[PDB]
With several copies, the nearest count.
Chain A
């Protein structure tokens, strides 16, 4: 179970482009195994990231930096300082093993993208940022986000992937614990600035806003509307148990520190400790209070099976009476 991350020995953009389009095919190939997909996906994410490359060296948490790319492909197989003949032909075969659902045997909706001469650095970085931004979009929680990132120029429409190619990357990221571990570092560096909003990390920080604290909505809404008000109804005995439970959950969030905002992405077992099912009374009390106080609370779902119908009405009545 070796996860090989390819590193190149040259900045020249034609080699960077060929390595990305080669790794993209492995991720989407029929015959590759997860281990091959995780390593090729990490190679794509590290190409614009001098910091992830600094976390791929022996680190982290295994990952062997196969690197050693002189390294231009002869055509589609590699030339390695590192390893063997049989793996060169095997990787070359995997790159041409695309599923039939992708038109013209290419991941892109435009059949003449891979044939482009990747002569200049801007045509690679525009291609690399467009492909990785489509990856970032499917890694958490897509319908209309692509329409937004198209109009904002964060994804060049020329480099759009076919929908099947997006869904495969979505599941490879979902299955890859190691891939998502390195994605957290990119989100952590996305915030706290990079190069007066480096075009890549400015986009990552924007996507970060969606990923951070995913699945903590019921927890924070309960902390806001039920415990931020400090109203006398909180002293009902039926809240006494969930009060101390929310106190341990709050202590737990503080103890986790930096990893607290990335529980959903890091596959933390603590994430569903924060689900509203563990405090359904105070949650229904908080939803009733929010229904009255906040205009954005409606229309919310309110369709959860553990939502108490009467404690929702207590919250409404407690909040409405600000007279």
Chain B
């Protein structure tokens, strides 16, 4: 169901929201 590539790893979303 998912491609063998993970640009989905948005750690940037994580560290932005834990300000």
- A residues whose Cβ falls under 8 Å from a Cβ of B: 58-60, 191, 209-210, 212-213, 216-217, 220, 223-224, 227-230, 234-235, 239-240, 243-244, 246-247, 250-251, 253-254, 261
Distance in Å: Cβ of A232 to nearest Cβ of chain B? 9
Could you say which of B1, B2, B5, B11 contacts A250, with CB atoms under 8 Å apart? B11
Interface CB pairs A-B, < 8 A, 14 = A191-B4, A212-B1, A217-B1, A220-B2, A223-B9, A229-B14, A230-B13, A230-B14, A230-B16, A234-B14, A243-B18, A246-B14, A247-B11, A250-B11
For B9, give the chain A residue with the smallest CB separation: A250
Which B residues touch A253, using CB under 8 A? 6, 9
Chain B residues with a Cβ closer than 8 Å to the other chain, count: 17
- CB of B9 within 8 A of CB of A234, answer no
Given contacts A224-B8, A228-B8, A240-B18, contact A234 B13 (CB under 8 A): yes
Could you say which of A216, A228, A239 contacts B10, with CB atoms under 8 Å apart? A228
Given contacts A59-B4, A213-B2, A230-B16, contact A254 B9 (CB under 8 A): yes
Which B residues touch A213, using CB under 8 A? 1-2
Could you say which of B2, B6, B8, B12 contacts A247, with CB atoms under 8 Å apart? B12
CA separation between A246 and B14, bound complex, in Å? 8
CA separation between A308 and B8, bound complex, in Å? 24
CA separation between A229 and B1, bound complex, in Å? 19
CA separation between A134 and B3, bound complex, in Å? 23
Which A residues touch B2, using CB under 8 A? 213, 216, 220
